[PDB]
Amino acid sequence: ISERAFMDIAIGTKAPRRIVFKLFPRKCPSAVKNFIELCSGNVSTDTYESGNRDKLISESALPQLTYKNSTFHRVEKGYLIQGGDIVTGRGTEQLSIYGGTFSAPEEVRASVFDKPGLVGTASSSPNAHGSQFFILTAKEANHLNGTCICFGQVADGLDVVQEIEQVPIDPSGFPSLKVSIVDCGVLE
Amino acid sequence: WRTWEYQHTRPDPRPFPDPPVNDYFGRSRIWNPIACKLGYVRKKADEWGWPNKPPPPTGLRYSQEFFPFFFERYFPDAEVRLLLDSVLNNETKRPVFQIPCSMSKVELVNYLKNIYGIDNVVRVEVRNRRGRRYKNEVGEIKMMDDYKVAVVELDTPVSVELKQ
Amino acid sequence: VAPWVPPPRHDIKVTMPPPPGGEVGGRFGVSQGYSDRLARTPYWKRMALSTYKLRMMENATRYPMSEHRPGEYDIRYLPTPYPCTIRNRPLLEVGEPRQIPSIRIPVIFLVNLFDEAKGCWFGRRYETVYVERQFMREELMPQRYAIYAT
Amino acid sequence: PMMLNIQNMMWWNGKRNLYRATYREKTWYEISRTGAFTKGRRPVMRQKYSREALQAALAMVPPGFEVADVPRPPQRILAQSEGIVGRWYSNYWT
Amino acid sequence: PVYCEALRRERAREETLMKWPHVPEWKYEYSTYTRKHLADIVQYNYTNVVDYVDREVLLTGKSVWECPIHIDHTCGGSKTVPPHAKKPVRYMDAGIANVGVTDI
Amino acid sequence: TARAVEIFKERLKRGIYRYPPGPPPPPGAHDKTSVVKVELSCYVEEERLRELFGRYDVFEPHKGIVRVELKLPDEVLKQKEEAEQLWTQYMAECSDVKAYHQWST
Amino acid sequence: MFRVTGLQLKNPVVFKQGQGMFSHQLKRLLQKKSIHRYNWDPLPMYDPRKLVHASRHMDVETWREVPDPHWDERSYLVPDQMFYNIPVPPEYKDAYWWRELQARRVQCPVEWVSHRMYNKGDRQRYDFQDLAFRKKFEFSYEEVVKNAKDMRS
Amino acid sequence: QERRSHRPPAWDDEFAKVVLNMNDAEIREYLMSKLTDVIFLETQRDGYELRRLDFEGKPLTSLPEPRIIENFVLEEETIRERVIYQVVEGVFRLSPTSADRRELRSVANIIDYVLTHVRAARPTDRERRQERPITSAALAVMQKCPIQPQLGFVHALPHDTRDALLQEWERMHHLDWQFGKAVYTPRSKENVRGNLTWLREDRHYDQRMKFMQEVESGEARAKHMKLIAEAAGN
Amino acid sequence: KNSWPEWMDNGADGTGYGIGLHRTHPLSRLRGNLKRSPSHVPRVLGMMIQGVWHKSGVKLYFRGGKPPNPSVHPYLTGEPCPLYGWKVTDESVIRQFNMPSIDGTNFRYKPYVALQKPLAKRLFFWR
Amino acid sequence: YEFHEPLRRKNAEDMRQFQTDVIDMACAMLGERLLDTVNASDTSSFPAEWQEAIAMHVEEIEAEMEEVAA
Amino acid sequence: MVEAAMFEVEKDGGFDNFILKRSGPELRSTYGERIRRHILVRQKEIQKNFVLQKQAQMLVESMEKEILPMEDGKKVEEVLEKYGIDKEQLLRDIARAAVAKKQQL
Numbered sequence A: 001i002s003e004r005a006f007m008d009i010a011i012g013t014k015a016p017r018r019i020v021f022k023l024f025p026r027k028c029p030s031a032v033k034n035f036i037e038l039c040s041g042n043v044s045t046d047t048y049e050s051g052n053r054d055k056l057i058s059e060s061a062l063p064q065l066t067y068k069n070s071t072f073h074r075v076e077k078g079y080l081i082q083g084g085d086i087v088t089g090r091g092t093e094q095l096s097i098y099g100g101t102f103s104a105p106e107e108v109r110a111s112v113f114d115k116p117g118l119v120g121t122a123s124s125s126p127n128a129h130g131s132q133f134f135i136l137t138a139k140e141a142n143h144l145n146g147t148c149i150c151f152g153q154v155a156d157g158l159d160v161v162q163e164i165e166q167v168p169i170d171p172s173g174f175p176s177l178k179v180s181i182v183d184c185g186v187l188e
Numbered sequence B: 001w002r003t004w005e006y007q008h009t010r011p012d013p014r015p016f017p018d019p020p021v022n023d024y025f026g027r028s029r030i031w032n033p034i035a036c037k038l039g040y041v042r043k044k045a046d047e048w049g050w051p052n053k054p055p056p057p058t059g060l061r062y063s064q065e066f067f068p069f070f071f072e073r074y075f076p077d078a079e080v081r082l083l084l085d086s087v088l089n090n091e092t093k094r095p096v097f098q099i100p101c102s103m104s105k106v107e108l109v110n111y112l113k114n115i116y117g118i119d120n121v122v123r124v125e126v127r128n129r130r131g132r133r134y135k136n137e138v139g140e141i142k143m144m145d146d147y148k149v150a151v152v153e154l155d156t157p158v159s160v161e162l163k164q
Numbered sequence C: 001v002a003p004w005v006p007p008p009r010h011d012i013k014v015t016m017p018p019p020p021g022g023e024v025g026g027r028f029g030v031s032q033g034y035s036d037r038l039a040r041t042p043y044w045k046r047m048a049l050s051t052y053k054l055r056m057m058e059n060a061t062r063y064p065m066s067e068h069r070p071g072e073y074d075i076r077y078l079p080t081p082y083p084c085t086i087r088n089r090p091l092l093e094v095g096e097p098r099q100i101p102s103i104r105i106p107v108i109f110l111v112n113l114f115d116e117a118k119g120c121w122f123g124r125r126y127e128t129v130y131v132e133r134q135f136m137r138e139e140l141m142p143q144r145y146a147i148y149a150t
Numbered sequence D: 001p002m003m004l005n006i007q008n009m010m011w012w013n014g015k016r017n018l019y020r021a022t023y024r025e026k027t028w029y030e031i032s033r034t035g036a037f038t039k040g041r042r043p044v045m046r047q048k049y050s051r052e053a054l055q056a057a058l059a060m061v062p063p064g065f066e067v068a069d070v071p072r073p074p075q076r077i078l079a080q081s082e083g084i085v086g087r088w089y090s091n092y093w094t
Numbered sequence E: 001p002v003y004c005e006a007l008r009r010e011r012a013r014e015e016t017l018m019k020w021p022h023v024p025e026w027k028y029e030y031s032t033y034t035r036k037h038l039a040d041i042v043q044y045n046y047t048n049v050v051d052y053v054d055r056e057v058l059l060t061g062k063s064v065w066e067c068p069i070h071i072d073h074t075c076g077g078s079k080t081v082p083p084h085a086k087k088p089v090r091y092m093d094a095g096i097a098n099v100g101v102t103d104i
Numbered sequence F: 001t002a003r004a005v006e007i008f009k010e011r012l013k014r015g016i017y018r019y020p021p022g023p024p025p026p027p028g029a030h031d032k033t034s035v036v037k038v039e040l041s042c043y044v045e046e047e048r049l050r051e052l053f054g055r056y057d058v059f060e061p062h063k064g065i066v067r068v069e070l071k072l073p074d075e076v077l078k079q080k081e082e083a084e085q086l087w088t089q090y091m092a093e094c095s096d097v098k099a100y101h102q103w104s105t
Numbered sequence G: 001m002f003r004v005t006g007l008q009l010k011n012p013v014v015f016k017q018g019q020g021m022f023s024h025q026l027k028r029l030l031q032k033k034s035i036h037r038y039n040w041d042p043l044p045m046y047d048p049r050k051l052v053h054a055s056r057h058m059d060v061e062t063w064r065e066v067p068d069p070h071w072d073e074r075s076y077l078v079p080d081q082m083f084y085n086i087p088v089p090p091e092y093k094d095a096y097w098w099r100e101l102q103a104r105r106v107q108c109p110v111e112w113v114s115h116r117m118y119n120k121g122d123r124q125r126y127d128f129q130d131l132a133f134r135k136k137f138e139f140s141y142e143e144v145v146k147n148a149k150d151m152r153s
Numbered sequence H: 001q002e003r004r005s006h007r008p009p010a011w012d013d014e015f016a017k018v019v020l021n022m023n024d025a026e027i028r029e030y031l032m033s034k035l036t037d038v039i040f041l042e043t044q045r046d047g048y049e050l051r052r053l054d055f056e057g058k059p060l061t062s063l064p065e066p067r068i069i070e071n072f073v074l075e076e077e078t079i080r081e082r083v084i085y086q087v088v089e090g091v092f093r094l095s096p097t098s099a100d101r102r103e104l105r106s107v108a109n110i111i112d113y114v115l116t117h118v119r120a121a122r123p124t125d126r127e128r129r130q131e132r133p134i135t136s137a138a139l140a141v142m143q144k145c146p147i148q149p150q151l152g153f154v155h156a157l158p159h160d161t162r163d164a165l166l167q168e169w170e171r172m173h174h175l176d177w178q179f180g181k182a183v184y185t186p187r188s189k190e191n192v193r194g195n196l197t198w199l200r201e202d203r204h205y206d207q208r209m210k211f212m213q214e215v216e217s218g219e220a221r222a223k224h225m226k227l228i229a230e231a232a233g234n
Numbered sequence I: 001k002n003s004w005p006e007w008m009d010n011g012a013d014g015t016g017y018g019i020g021l022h023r024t025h026p027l028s029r030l031r032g033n034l035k036r037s038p039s040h041v042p043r044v045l046g047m048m049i050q051g052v053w054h055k056s057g058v059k060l061y062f063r064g065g066k067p068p069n070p071s072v073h074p075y076l077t078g079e080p081c082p083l084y085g086w087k088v089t090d091e092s093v094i095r096q097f098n099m100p101s102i103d104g105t106n107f108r109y110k111p112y113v114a115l116q117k118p119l120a121k122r123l124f125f126w127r
Numbered sequence J: 001y002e003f004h005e006p007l008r009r010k011n012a013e014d015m016r017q018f019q020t021d022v023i024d025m026a027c028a029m030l031g032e033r034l035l036d037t038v039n040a041s042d043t044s045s046f047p048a049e050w051q052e053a054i055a056m057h058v059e060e061i062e063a064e065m066e067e068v069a070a
Numbered sequence K: 001m002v003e004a005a006m007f008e009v010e011k012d013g014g015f016d017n018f019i020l021k022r023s024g025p026e027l028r029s030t031y032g033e034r035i036r037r038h039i040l041v042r043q044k045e046i047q048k049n050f051v052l053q054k055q056a057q058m059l060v061e062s063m064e065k066e067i068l069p070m071e072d073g074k075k076v077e078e079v080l081e082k083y084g085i086d087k088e089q090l091l092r093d094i095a096r097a098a099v100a101k102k103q104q105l
């Protein structure tokens, strides 16, 4: 199973920089598969004229299972950087491949966070996980043990993370510079 | 006026009003819409043992896991009675049943399909009916519980013979 | 229904009860304050949390005056638990006409005001002048030419 | 309204006057009992201390004090004594 | 402030259910109103079961221990009192039964 | 439901929930204050402690401190309770002996 | 009052005032009493839960308020049923003075518990503060007997 | 809700800057004069003389009257479409919507329409901030400043349910300040004289500066140590 | 303005279909015109005693004879649509009875527990 | 959060507007100080472009005062 | 209000001072509560404007030490761009101050 993903992050008009994630499918087969499918984004469903007319709606009208044209909504300097919201760029709703949200209690129990630069599922409830992922920046956050689930770590691109973290924050609560994701894929 | 002659007791109002208990047990019995405090107290007490046990949080109270709804969903209680005259020693295509008033046509057809396996149900004719009233030897008016009459239609006529 | 009942006002003493709510600022009608916490607190716990000097300082009485409402007597010392009326009362007693004359109030001027009609100065800068009430209220105050002398 | 000589009582007809106190700490008859309110022929301090206890109570008196300083309270003030407490010399009856 | 407001709303909805509606634990009106005479009890809860079981025991001889019919001595009045009702303790009753005399 | 409400109250006390989905900020980065516990041999007024521990550079009535709260350990509290119990017993016994031997003397 | 109002409303709406069993049952069912719950008068002019973010400085970096411990301490708590307690700066606590009285008062018509103030025993054993008929402390019989026996009198 | 200032692509950036440099109250008179001249030309071409003529020798007046212009409304298509194509596309370079043309009959409606459009074309506060940010040196000096402003006081306003027509009638009958009512208007600069609040704040700032001088000289710590020694001695 | 839907007020269908009192499930999102308020009791009592008179000339609720019992109505399941006869918007309201799976002990059990003939018409059977 | 988010968004906007007004009043004080120091002290004048702009804006403000007085 | 209210509001020295001295049940009116909330928020705005003016004073006093000589126009432009203050509006404010001083004299 492919355990390596890559993303191209762009800060406003700056050039897209590459960030690389290395995931562990053994300790959490659900979240890793969800993230791999969302980074792949198989949305090549091409329809015809009569097909689109009888369906009355393009299948792209619904939210697509991909991180393409996503944004990093929560960027707090010194702690972490959160992003990956699908349905909207504000970061107020999650969505997984299985449905609205999944749950992995046996994995989230054994999930621990002891390193700088880990990747976890940013969730509101310990059993309500979606597409939003957060990359930790601080030294260690042991208060998240048993609440969120770690699945992978930023292998290459810590400089990219530290550069994204230094964005000024608009009074609206979002980063002043629109930190978005140009492309995202999986490397086998 | 000589007010000093009386003591301090509130006299009964004239004309005195009747107790709020409905004493009519006929065809036109009315359900009282006014809600009493004792009703809420009893509901809460049967729900979570008020006031000894602490109240469950609003989430569990309004969720599908609250004890009354959980028990009604995992251990349903529906009294379905078959009329012996409608299907006894006669090949009838419209057997009738008696159900609680809280059920409907879809409720009854799902009941018969899942519990008793009667899947071929054409149409259920619903008609409410007031509970049976009667007097005992001493003359007390005791009314049986209300029941809803249903007339289910099948594709094939059924009959349960009585071996004479 | 009341989910949270507010504690008694000015419940700062560790051994003695707070003054009545009417004296603190609440509703009158009662002549003694009460505290559920101070009542349920055991006497040994009170004596442990307190000391003799603090006990004396809390038992210090201001008979027959009041500490929180200065200038007037205490509602518990008064016969009725309501505050006195002869001190603060309406400006016109019963059976009395309104024969109050025109009073002149002192006012502090902020600028050298020169009356053009009479040809003189109303008041020099930072001068305390006894002027008409209506004059000060309707003309001097709005233009900020003078402020009330306090 | 003016409630001119209207016998509005709860036990009499179930109606009470619109302008009245819902609670009364002392009935009007208790207020009229001026013998128990004021200090007339009646003791006010019910604590009787020994000789050594009086000397201890007089020890906390600050110097420079005089009985002529404390005036007699008016008739509209209850005559009560809290015993030997802080600032007891301020209380006229104590 | 958001988490605090959520917590306080939860505590509010908890205390509201815990305190409302406030019914008295016990009052003498309960025992005054739930008192029915023997004739009223017999008129309220009677069935032919008692006479039938009397005839049956007279004809058979079987020993019956419990009453065949559940007697509600309140005639439907016990359902009017709240469930958590209990008689308060009355100290120093003005009675002689507590002495337990057996000779007078 | 008892087990569940216990677990849920523990979670709520930990404070891990947040409507914007994501881990909450850490407590150490937020608690920008400190507490100092001083042991005294006798009771001292709170305003006295405030004016004696106040910051001489802060031009505010709180003087760089938020609140001063006095307490007694459970050990000394139980000791005071047992002491007052023994004192009541001693007063009772002394009065009893006095009233018993006043007639023997 | 409410019973007579409901009776008049039902008579004007659905009662034919005949000997029919409908009206015969209404005349007895309308005597039933409805639920009573003291609803505090809401304040649309001033929302107390809105002033939480008032009188607070903010960090220019993150553009969010500063958790001032002095403000959190000196905050005055206003009570309300759906919003059990709400902190508010002490400068604005004056406008919410009536909510304080409505919360301190017992959430029950005074004439339902008026049997308390009409006797000396309850007048001495109960509290009357802002119309709050909450029972004071009262020692048990065992407690008072033990106290008197320890005091040897 | 986030507002974005938009300019129609009909005109170029140069004309956009030229128009936006004009003030609304000042550009209103320019629009008025342009539309007056084109309406006068249309009326002269049609043959109806709107200008006044003295019955003595039938002379023409100076120019049309502003009140006559405000009272003049467009009801014929050959007039309203002409003036629309003349001023909306000619001098302002705007295009009307089909539905909006139903309300564009009135000249006051045309004025309000073009005013709303130029107000929308004008930049917003967020765009002004993005153009001119705050510098680290300014932040540093504002932090070195001892006093800092308090906020959130706008939430203390009495929020009531008021209608626009009710508010207009209130303003017309001067009832904005009657029965304990008021109107909140944010003011950066404040008149400073006879202001008791400002005087108290001046006194507080002076006391703060004196306290800062004391703590810089070291007399504050001296007084604190004297109090400490007194408490240790007594 | 009222809380219950305006089709519940006056049925959207031409024949006044879907008018009257509709009790709703506590967990259901839909609301009904059945309210026990002291101010909502007169109309809800008139709906039972008299009924509603339609413009077409037919009495929809309580046509006559026997008064209905609004407290025992099965919970509301949807809203009436003009295209079909009925549009279901809440499927969780309709209860779905389900039978447990069979097991070695399940097919061995019986209703009553075993503790350690010609029919004759009798007037009374004790047990 | 839906109730509390605009309450802090408005405070953030108000802080930003406060900073902008600070900058504006600072510019005003700069103008006043540079003016009452240049005309007071000697051998201290603005560049040629600055002087021309100041003169033209003075003429514009005088014309505006004439317009508002007429 | 009443005549006694007018007398006491002239005594205590201002309507705002009166409305601030009276609090809670002593001020039973609702017009008074509304006008008191308005006075409170206006006072908060006054304090904010004071802090604003003090910040402006400190900023101009700090940045005047670099444009006091006014020897090099480009140096003055560099000092201005160090903080980011606009130049066209600065010249406009200079001209406004000039016109104001001319009208004063």
Ligand SMILES: NC(=O)c1ccc[n+]([C@@H]2O[C@H](COP(=O)([O-])OP(=O)(O)OC[C@H]3O[C@@H](n4cnc5c(N)ncnc54)[C@H](O)[C@@H]3O)[C@@H](O)[C@H]2O)c1
Binding pocket: D040, D041, D042, D043, D044, D045, D046, D047, D048
């Ligand atoms: N009209 C009257 O004042 C009146 C009437 C009858 C008797 N007396 C007697 O006159 C004396 C003084 O009266 P007064 O009005 O000046 O003061 P008082 O009686 O009002 O107060 C005297 C104080 O000394 C205490 N006291 C009284 N008798 C005592 C005793 N034998 N030993 C110790 N303490 C005692 C009282 O309890 C009180 O604390 C008292 O003995 C009193 O009983 C007075």
